[PDB]
Amino acid sequence: SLMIAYVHSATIIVSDQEKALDFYVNTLGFEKVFDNQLDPNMRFVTVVPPGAQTQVALGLPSWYEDGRKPGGYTGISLITRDIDEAYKTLTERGVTFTKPPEMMPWGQRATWFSDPDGNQFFLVEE
Amino acid sequence: SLMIAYVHSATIIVSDQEKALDFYVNTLGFEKVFDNQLDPNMRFVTVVPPGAQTQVALGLPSWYEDGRKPGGYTGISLITRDIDEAYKTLTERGVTFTKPPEMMPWGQRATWFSDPDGNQFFLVEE
């Protein structure tokens, strides 16, 4: 056995789990996976790109003791197979991008977008 | 096309990229993927569990302007197929765990462990 099979999930911090679900599911096209009370103070909620392995947990500041809050660079990079389409349709859907897709000096087109809380993702064409 | 196909990577903050590569590769069994000097100040380094899709970027505090430092809860959960063996082996390799694996009230066995910089992961048996 491998020590580690895969990354289950990474976490972002949001201000409202229900509103975040609406955004990730209806705007970004993810699917909800977890939505479970692990205890009375944690509603464990995750979303996943359709058909993908690794999930994103939609956490709250209250989950944590160190003051982590929504907004800023998430350190999460996302892949799309058609960045021109993603940019067009996500812009139509009201997503905030920094600029249109642009060629990076490692040979892939990319841009950045944010969720409603200001969490920023790097979006890269496969 | 999907708006978003999959999560490429999530980022942790380490103190020393070469020491962290040693840990993730030789202690945890990940494989190095990226190791690319994007600019004189940004060495983009990633690791992946063998065979898995989403990577972990081994970032530095210098990557960010917001004062983020190594250590604490990463928000990253990891799956193993044999937690007893992982716990045993990793313990032998000097990894710090909070407790031995135990049954969570959602019906899976899990524990927490730390990398050398104190970054904490939740480890769950598939």
PDB file of C-alpha atoms in Angstrom:
ATOM      1  CA  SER A   1       0.000   0.000   0.000  1.00  0.00           C
ATOM      2  CA  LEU A   2       1.035   3.575  -0.795  1.00  0.00           C
ATOM      3  CA  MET A   3       1.295   5.813   2.198  1.00  0.00           C
ATOM      4  CA  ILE A   4      -1.127   8.181   0.313  1.00  0.00           C
ATOM      5  CA  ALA A   5      -3.588   7.376  -2.499  1.00  0.00           C
ATOM      6  CA  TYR A   6      -4.826  10.897  -3.355  1.00  0.00           C
ATOM      7  CA  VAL A   7      -5.783  14.354  -2.140  1.00  0.00           C
ATOM      8  CA  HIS A   8      -9.399  14.106  -0.937  1.00  0.00           C
ATOM      9  CA  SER A   9     -10.092  17.838  -0.750  1.00  0.00           C
ATOM     10  CA  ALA A  10      -8.689  21.315  -0.195  1.00  0.00           C
ATOM     11  CA  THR A  11     -10.611  24.032   1.617  1.00  0.00           C
ATOM     12  CA  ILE A  12     -11.639  27.595   0.820  1.00  0.00           C
ATOM     13  CA  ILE A  13     -13.204  30.020   3.321  1.00  0.00           C
ATOM     14  CA  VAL A  14     -16.581  31.493   2.522  1.00  0.00           C
ATOM     15  CA  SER A  15     -18.990  33.750   4.457  1.00  0.00           C
ATOM     16  CA  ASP A  16     -22.157  31.750   3.728  1.00  0.00           C
ATOM     17  CA  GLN A  17     -22.224  28.108   2.854  1.00  0.00           C
ATOM     18  CA  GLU A  18     -25.625  28.157   1.068  1.00  0.00           C
ATOM     19  CA  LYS A  19     -24.698  31.109  -1.107  1.00  0.00           C
ATOM     20  CA  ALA A  20     -21.319  29.525  -1.841  1.00  0.00           C
ATOM     21  CA  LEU A  21     -23.043  26.314  -2.916  1.00  0.00           C
ATOM     22  CA  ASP A  22     -25.240  28.296  -5.300  1.00  0.00           C
ATOM     23  CA  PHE A  23     -22.184  29.915  -6.841  1.00  0.00           C
ATOM     24  CA  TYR A  24     -19.977  26.784  -7.175  1.00  0.00           C
ATOM     25  CA  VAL A  25     -22.827  24.521  -8.324  1.00  0.00           C
ATOM     26  CA  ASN A  26     -24.959  26.866 -10.525  1.00  0.00           C
ATOM     27  CA  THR A  27     -22.370  29.302 -11.743  1.00  0.00           C
ATOM     28  CA  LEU A  28     -19.180  27.165 -11.959  1.00  0.00           C
ATOM     29  CA  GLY A  29     -20.893  23.893 -12.731  1.00  0.00           C
ATOM     30  CA  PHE A  30     -19.535  21.868  -9.827  1.00  0.00           C
ATOM     31  CA  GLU A  31     -21.569  19.099  -8.161  1.00  0.00           C
ATOM     32  CA  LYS A  32     -22.310  19.007  -4.395  1.00  0.00           C
ATOM     33  CA  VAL A  33     -20.888  15.969  -2.634  1.00  0.00           C
ATOM     34  CA  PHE A  34     -20.796  16.358   1.143  1.00  0.00           C
ATOM     35  CA  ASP A  35     -23.448  18.194   3.128  1.00  0.00           C
ATOM     36  CA  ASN A  36     -23.310  16.712   6.552  1.00  0.00           C
ATOM     37  CA  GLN A  37     -23.127  17.791  10.220  1.00  0.00           C
ATOM     38  CA  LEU A  38     -19.945  16.218  11.465  1.00  0.00           C
ATOM     39  CA  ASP A  39     -20.853  17.955  14.746  1.00  0.00           C
ATOM     40  CA  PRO A  40     -23.290  20.718  15.843  1.00  0.00           C
ATOM     41  CA  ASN A  41     -20.837  23.491  14.848  1.00  0.00           C
ATOM     42  CA  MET A  42     -19.570  22.068  11.535  1.00  0.00           C
ATOM     43  CA  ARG A  43     -21.742  21.542   8.443  1.00  0.00           C
ATOM     44  CA  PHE A  44     -19.198  19.838   6.250  1.00  0.00           C
ATOM     45  CA  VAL A  45     -19.920  20.887   2.629  1.00  0.00           C
ATOM     46  CA  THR A  46     -17.943  19.996  -0.449  1.00  0.00           C
ATOM     47  CA  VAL A  47     -18.226  20.479  -4.208  1.00  0.00           C
ATOM     48  CA  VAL A  48     -16.402  18.791  -7.110  1.00  0.00           C
ATOM     49  CA  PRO A  49     -15.900  19.441 -10.806  1.00  0.00           C
ATOM     50  CA  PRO A  50     -18.019  16.881 -12.689  1.00  0.00           C
ATOM     51  CA  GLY A  51     -16.200  13.562 -13.010  1.00  0.00           C
ATOM     52  CA  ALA A  52     -13.131  14.738 -11.038  1.00  0.00           C
ATOM     53  CA  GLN A  53     -11.473  13.179  -7.984  1.00  0.00           C
ATOM     54  CA  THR A  54     -10.432  16.018  -5.617  1.00  0.00           C
ATOM     55  CA  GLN A  55     -13.193  18.092  -3.938  1.00  0.00           C
ATOM     56  CA  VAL A  56     -13.214  21.645  -2.569  1.00  0.00           C
ATOM     57  CA  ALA A  57     -14.595  22.076   0.966  1.00  0.00           C
ATOM     58  CA  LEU A  58     -16.612  25.288   1.534  1.00  0.00           C
ATOM     59  CA  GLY A  59     -15.436  26.165   5.025  1.00  0.00           C
ATOM     60  CA  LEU A  60     -16.398  29.019   7.381  1.00  0.00           C
ATOM     61  CA  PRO A  61     -14.162  31.239   9.456  1.00  0.00           C
ATOM     62  CA  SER A  62     -15.806  29.686  12.487  1.00  0.00           C
ATOM     63  CA  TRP A  63     -14.286  26.327  11.662  1.00  0.00           C
ATOM     64  CA  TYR A  64     -10.882  27.691  12.644  1.00  0.00           C
ATOM     65  CA  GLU A  65      -8.983  29.099  15.618  1.00  0.00           C
ATOM     66  CA  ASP A  66      -6.453  31.132  13.699  1.00  0.00           C
ATOM     67  CA  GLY A  67      -8.578  33.886  12.208  1.00  0.00           C
ATOM     68  CA  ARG A  68      -8.500  32.746   8.606  1.00  0.00           C
ATOM     69  CA  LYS A  69     -11.125  34.569   6.597  1.00  0.00           C
ATOM     70  CA  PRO A  70     -12.489  34.683   3.075  1.00  0.00           C
ATOM     71  CA  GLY A  71     -10.786  36.478   0.205  1.00  0.00           C
ATOM     72  CA  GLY A  72      -7.446  36.558  -1.478  1.00  0.00           C
ATOM     73  CA  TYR A  73      -5.289  34.054  -3.291  1.00  0.00           C
ATOM     74  CA  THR A  74      -6.482  30.565  -2.581  1.00  0.00           C
ATOM     75  CA  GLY A  75      -3.393  28.846  -3.955  1.00  0.00           C
ATOM     76  CA  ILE A  76      -5.893  26.672  -5.945  1.00  0.00           C
ATOM     77  CA  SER A  77      -5.427  26.363  -9.680  1.00  0.00           C
ATOM     78  CA  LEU A  78      -8.260  25.014 -11.847  1.00  0.00           C
ATOM     79  CA  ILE A  79      -8.085  23.379 -15.296  1.00  0.00           C
ATOM     80  CA  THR A  80     -10.543  23.907 -18.133  1.00  0.00           C
ATOM     81  CA  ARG A  81     -10.392  22.284 -21.558  1.00  0.00           C
ATOM     82  CA  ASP A  82     -11.703  25.436 -23.373  1.00  0.00           C
ATOM     83  CA  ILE A  83     -10.693  28.683 -21.712  1.00  0.00           C
ATOM     84  CA  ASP A  84     -12.285  30.920 -24.341  1.00  0.00           C
ATOM     85  CA  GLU A  85     -15.653  29.261 -23.698  1.00  0.00           C
ATOM     86  CA  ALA A  86     -15.157  29.312 -19.917  1.00  0.00           C
ATOM     87  CA  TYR A  87     -14.305  32.989 -20.008  1.00  0.00           C
ATOM     88  CA  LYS A  88     -17.258  33.865 -22.291  1.00  0.00           C
ATOM     89  CA  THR A  89     -19.908  31.848 -20.437  1.00  0.00           C
ATOM     90  CA  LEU A  90     -18.655  32.594 -16.919  1.00  0.00           C
ATOM     91  CA  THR A  91     -18.523  36.334 -17.746  1.00  0.00           C
ATOM     92  CA  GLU A  92     -22.182  36.076 -19.016  1.00  0.00           C
ATOM     93  CA  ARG A  93     -23.016  34.414 -15.654  1.00  0.00           C
ATOM     94  CA  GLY A  94     -21.519  37.378 -13.759  1.00  0.00           C
ATOM     95  CA  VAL A  95     -18.103  36.110 -12.771  1.00  0.00           C
ATOM     96  CA  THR A  96     -15.335  38.618 -12.193  1.00  0.00           C
ATOM     97  CA  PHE A  97     -12.168  37.981 -14.167  1.00  0.00           C
ATOM     98  CA  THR A  98      -9.005  40.056 -13.928  1.00  0.00           C
ATOM     99  CA  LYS A  99      -8.592  40.117 -17.763  1.00  0.00           C
ATOM    100  CA  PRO A 100      -9.170  37.844 -20.746  1.00  0.00           C
ATOM    101  CA  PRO A 101      -7.158  34.644 -21.212  1.00  0.00           C
ATOM    102  CA  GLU A 102      -3.575  35.326 -22.038  1.00  0.00           C
ATOM    103  CA  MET A 103      -0.576  33.236 -23.005  1.00  0.00           C
ATOM    104  CA  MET A 104       1.678  32.408 -20.157  1.00  0.00           C
ATOM    105  CA  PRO A 105       5.439  32.099 -20.809  1.00  0.00           C
ATOM    106  CA  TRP A 106       5.207  28.344 -20.133  1.00  0.00           C
ATOM    107  CA  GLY A 107       2.927  27.827 -23.161  1.00  0.00           C
ATOM    108  CA  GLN A 108      -0.610  27.664 -21.727  1.00  0.00           C
ATOM    109  CA  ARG A 109      -3.339  30.229 -21.713  1.00  0.00           C
ATOM    110  CA  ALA A 110      -4.613  31.370 -18.327  1.00  0.00           C
ATOM    111  CA  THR A 111      -6.404  34.017 -16.354  1.00  0.00           C
ATOM    112  CA  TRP A 112      -7.746  34.671 -12.848  1.00  0.00           C
ATOM    113  CA  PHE A 113     -11.224  34.911 -11.457  1.00  0.00           C
ATOM    114  CA  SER A 114     -12.874  35.326  -8.092  1.00  0.00           C
ATOM    115  CA  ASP A 115     -15.848  33.986  -6.218  1.00  0.00           C
ATOM    116  CA  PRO A 116     -18.344  36.350  -4.468  1.00  0.00           C
ATOM    117  CA  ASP A 117     -16.202  36.433  -1.317  1.00  0.00           C
ATOM    118  CA  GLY A 118     -13.176  37.479  -3.270  1.00  0.00           C
ATOM    119  CA  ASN A 119     -11.427  34.095  -3.233  1.00  0.00           C
ATOM    120  CA  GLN A 120      -9.132  34.064  -6.255  1.00  0.00           C
ATOM    121  CA  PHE A 121      -8.401  31.096  -8.513  1.00  0.00           C
ATOM    122  CA  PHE A 122      -5.909  30.676 -11.362  1.00  0.00           C
ATOM    123  CA  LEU A 123      -7.715  29.226 -14.388  1.00  0.00           C
ATOM    124  CA  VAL A 124      -5.535  27.378 -16.910  1.00  0.00           C
ATOM    125  CA  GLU A 125      -6.354  25.764 -20.230  1.00  0.00           C
ATOM    126  CA  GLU A 126      -5.248  22.137 -20.393  1.00  0.00           C
TER     127      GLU A 126
ATOM    128  CA  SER B   1     -17.005  21.654 -22.571  1.00  0.00           C
ATOM    129  CA  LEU B   2     -17.111  21.843 -18.713  1.00  0.00           C
ATOM    130  CA  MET B   3     -16.531  25.311 -17.287  1.00  0.00           C
ATOM    131  CA  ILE B   4     -14.044  23.607 -14.897  1.00  0.00           C
ATOM    132  CA  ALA B   5     -12.621  20.094 -15.473  1.00  0.00           C
ATOM    133  CA  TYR B   6     -10.597  19.490 -12.284  1.00  0.00           C
ATOM    134  CA  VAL B   7      -8.517  20.988  -9.547  1.00  0.00           C
ATOM    135  CA  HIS B   8      -4.905  21.153 -10.739  1.00  0.00           C
ATOM    136  CA  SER B   9      -3.291  21.818  -7.433  1.00  0.00           C
ATOM    137  CA  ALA B  10      -3.547  23.305  -3.966  1.00  0.00           C
ATOM    138  CA  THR B  11      -0.738  25.110  -2.186  1.00  0.00           C
ATOM    139  CA  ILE B  12       0.946  24.671   1.178  1.00  0.00           C
ATOM    140  CA  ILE B  13       3.552  26.980   2.703  1.00  0.00           C
ATOM    141  CA  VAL B  14       6.893  25.424   3.603  1.00  0.00           C
ATOM    142  CA  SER B  15      10.107  26.963   4.971  1.00  0.00           C
ATOM    143  CA  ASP B  16      12.540  25.282   2.561  1.00  0.00           C
ATOM    144  CA  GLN B  17      11.503  23.829  -0.753  1.00  0.00           C
ATOM    145  CA  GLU B  18      14.399  21.339  -1.025  1.00  0.00           C
ATOM    146  CA  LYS B  19      13.776  19.951   2.472  1.00  0.00           C
ATOM    147  CA  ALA B  20      10.046  19.798   1.820  1.00  0.00           C
ATOM    148  CA  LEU B  21      10.625  17.855  -1.450  1.00  0.00           C
ATOM    149  CA  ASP B  22      12.712  15.384   0.627  1.00  0.00           C
ATOM    150  CA  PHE B  23       9.868  14.942   3.039  1.00  0.00           C
ATOM    151  CA  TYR B  24       6.991  14.637   0.598  1.00  0.00           C
ATOM    152  CA  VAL B  25       8.881  12.415  -1.848  1.00  0.00           C
ATOM    153  CA  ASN B  26      11.018  10.213   0.474  1.00  0.00           C
ATOM    154  CA  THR B  27       8.917  10.124   3.661  1.00  0.00           C
ATOM    155  CA  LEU B  28       5.308  10.375   2.295  1.00  0.00           C
ATOM    156  CA  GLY B  29       5.962   8.651  -1.024  1.00  0.00           C
ATOM    157  CA  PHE B  30       4.737  11.408  -3.367  1.00  0.00           C
ATOM    158  CA  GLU B  31       6.303  11.962  -6.810  1.00  0.00           C
ATOM    159  CA  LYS B  32       7.794  15.262  -7.918  1.00  0.00           C
ATOM    160  CA  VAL B  33       6.028  16.828 -10.916  1.00  0.00           C
ATOM    161  CA  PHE B  34       6.880  20.497 -11.412  1.00  0.00           C
ATOM    162  CA  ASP B  35      10.244  21.973 -10.628  1.00  0.00           C
ATOM    163  CA  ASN B  36      10.464  25.092 -12.765  1.00  0.00           C
ATOM    164  CA  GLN B  37      12.040  28.506 -12.185  1.00  0.00           C
ATOM    165  CA  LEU B  38       9.291  30.727 -13.462  1.00  0.00           C
ATOM    166  CA  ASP B  39      11.261  33.841 -12.329  1.00  0.00           C
ATOM    167  CA  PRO B  40      14.442  34.470 -10.281  1.00  0.00           C
ATOM    168  CA  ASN B  41      12.204  34.555  -7.204  1.00  0.00           C
ATOM    169  CA  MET B  42       9.626  31.862  -8.016  1.00  0.00           C
ATOM    170  CA  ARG B  43      10.607  28.148  -8.187  1.00  0.00           C
ATOM    171  CA  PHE B  44       7.330  26.376  -8.893  1.00  0.00           C
ATOM    172  CA  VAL B  45       7.497  22.978  -7.200  1.00  0.00           C
ATOM    173  CA  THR B  46       4.737  20.378  -7.011  1.00  0.00           C
ATOM    174  CA  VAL B  47       4.287  16.857  -5.699  1.00  0.00           C
ATOM    175  CA  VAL B  48       1.572  14.259  -6.325  1.00  0.00           C
ATOM    176  CA  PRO B  49       0.509  10.979  -4.744  1.00  0.00           C
ATOM    177  CA  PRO B  50       1.489   8.265  -7.257  1.00  0.00           C
ATOM    178  CA  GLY B  51      -1.139   7.795  -9.936  1.00  0.00           C
ATOM    179  CA  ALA B  52      -3.349  10.674  -8.651  1.00  0.00           C
ATOM    180  CA  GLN B  53      -4.591  13.774 -10.479  1.00  0.00           C
ATOM    181  CA  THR B  54      -4.404  16.794  -8.138  1.00  0.00           C
ATOM    182  CA  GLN B  55      -1.040  18.024  -7.040  1.00  0.00           C
ATOM    183  CA  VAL B  56       0.295  19.882  -3.994  1.00  0.00           C
ATOM    184  CA  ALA B  57       2.431  22.988  -4.625  1.00  0.00           C
ATOM    185  CA  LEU B  58       5.240  23.503  -2.131  1.00  0.00           C
ATOM    186  CA  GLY B  59       5.079  27.248  -1.758  1.00  0.00           C
ATOM    187  CA  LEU B  60       7.118  29.728   0.280  1.00  0.00           C
ATOM    188  CA  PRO B  61       6.087  32.769   2.343  1.00  0.00           C
ATOM    189  CA  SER B  62       7.863  34.848  -0.358  1.00  0.00           C
ATOM    190  CA  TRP B  63       5.251  33.763  -2.857  1.00  0.00           C
ATOM    191  CA  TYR B  64       2.701  35.953  -1.033  1.00  0.00           C
ATOM    192  CA  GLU B  65       2.393  39.515   0.290  1.00  0.00           C
ATOM    193  CA  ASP B  66      -0.078  38.753   3.095  1.00  0.00           C
ATOM    194  CA  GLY B  67       2.249  37.355   5.703  1.00  0.00           C
ATOM    195  CA  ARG B  68       1.291  33.682   5.350  1.00  0.00           C
ATOM    196  CA  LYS B  69       3.727  31.361   7.161  1.00  0.00           C
ATOM    197  CA  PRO B  70       4.222  27.665   7.430  1.00  0.00           C
ATOM    198  CA  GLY B  71       2.359  25.511   9.845  1.00  0.00           C
ATOM    199  CA  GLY B  72      -1.117  24.815  11.156  1.00  0.00           C
ATOM    200  CA  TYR B  73      -4.195  23.260   9.564  1.00  0.00           C
ATOM    201  CA  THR B  74      -3.817  23.137   5.811  1.00  0.00           C
ATOM    202  CA  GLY B  75      -7.462  22.369   5.024  1.00  0.00           C
ATOM    203  CA  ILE B  76      -6.119  19.468   2.929  1.00  0.00           C
ATOM    204  CA  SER B  77      -7.396  15.930   3.597  1.00  0.00           C
ATOM    205  CA  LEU B  78      -5.578  12.865   2.294  1.00  0.00           C
ATOM    206  CA  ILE B  79      -6.823   9.367   1.565  1.00  0.00           C
ATOM    207  CA  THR B  80      -4.928   6.141   2.340  1.00  0.00           C
ATOM    208  CA  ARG B  81      -6.072   2.571   1.618  1.00  0.00           C
ATOM    209  CA  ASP B  82      -4.395   1.220   4.765  1.00  0.00           C
ATOM    210  CA  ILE B  83      -4.215   3.682   7.671  1.00  0.00           C
ATOM    211  CA  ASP B  84      -2.738   1.154  10.115  1.00  0.00           C
ATOM    212  CA  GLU B  85       0.244   0.606   7.811  1.00  0.00           C
ATOM    213  CA  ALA B  86       0.601   4.306   7.021  1.00  0.00           C
ATOM    214  CA  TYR B  87       0.551   5.161  10.750  1.00  0.00           C
ATOM    215  CA  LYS B  88       3.112   2.470  11.570  1.00  0.00           C
ATOM    216  CA  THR B  89       5.501   3.358   8.771  1.00  0.00           C
ATOM    217  CA  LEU B  90       5.176   7.071   9.050  1.00  0.00           C
ATOM    218  CA  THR B  91       5.718   6.839  12.825  1.00  0.00           C
ATOM    219  CA  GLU B  92       8.922   4.820  12.181  1.00  0.00           C
ATOM    220  CA  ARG B  93       9.997   7.639   9.786  1.00  0.00           C
ATOM    221  CA  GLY B  94       9.517  10.179  12.636  1.00  0.00           C
ATOM    222  CA  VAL B  95       6.219  11.814  11.568  1.00  0.00           C
ATOM    223  CA  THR B  96       4.213  13.454  14.286  1.00  0.00           C
ATOM    224  CA  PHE B  97       0.623  12.303  14.681  1.00  0.00           C
ATOM    225  CA  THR B  98      -1.923  13.729  17.098  1.00  0.00           C
ATOM    226  CA  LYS B  99      -3.262  10.287  17.987  1.00  0.00           C
ATOM    227  CA  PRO B 100      -3.410   6.785  16.604  1.00  0.00           C
ATOM    228  CA  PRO B 101      -6.103   6.123  13.969  1.00  0.00           C
ATOM    229  CA  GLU B 102      -9.532   6.002  15.344  1.00  0.00           C
ATOM    230  CA  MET B 103     -13.074   5.548  14.216  1.00  0.00           C
ATOM    231  CA  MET B 104     -14.832   8.782  13.378  1.00  0.00           C
ATOM    232  CA  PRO B 105     -18.519   9.006  14.050  1.00  0.00           C
ATOM    233  CA  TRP B 106     -19.151   9.159  10.334  1.00  0.00           C
ATOM    234  CA  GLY B 107     -17.784   5.607  10.072  1.00  0.00           C
ATOM    235  CA  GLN B 108     -14.279   5.989   8.794  1.00  0.00           C
ATOM    236  CA  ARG B 109     -10.976   5.686  10.583  1.00  0.00           C
ATOM    237  CA  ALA B 110      -8.750   8.767  10.571  1.00  0.00           C
ATOM    238  CA  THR B 111      -6.045  10.742  12.269  1.00  0.00           C
ATOM    239  CA  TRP B 112      -4.005  13.899  11.848  1.00  0.00           C
ATOM    240  CA  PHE B 113      -0.303  14.292  11.099  1.00  0.00           C
ATOM    241  CA  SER B 114       2.142  17.101  10.478  1.00  0.00           C
ATOM    242  CA  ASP B 115       4.975  17.771   8.048  1.00  0.00           C
ATOM    243  CA  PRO B 116       8.284  19.078   9.505  1.00  0.00           C
ATOM    244  CA  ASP B 117       7.034  22.706   9.246  1.00  0.00           C
ATOM    245  CA  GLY B 118       3.949  21.843  11.228  1.00  0.00           C
ATOM    246  CA  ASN B 119       1.520  21.803   8.297  1.00  0.00           C
ATOM    247  CA  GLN B 120      -1.306  19.519   9.379  1.00  0.00           C
ATOM    248  CA  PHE B 121      -3.254  17.088   7.255  1.00  0.00           C
ATOM    249  CA  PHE B 122      -6.281  14.987   7.966  1.00  0.00           C
ATOM    250  CA  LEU B 123      -5.600  11.354   6.949  1.00  0.00           C
ATOM    251  CA  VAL B 124      -8.561   9.158   6.271  1.00  0.00           C
ATOM    252  CA  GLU B 125      -8.844   5.483   5.303  1.00  0.00           C
ATOM    253  CA  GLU B 126     -10.789   4.967   2.117  1.00  0.00           C
TER     254      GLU B 126
END
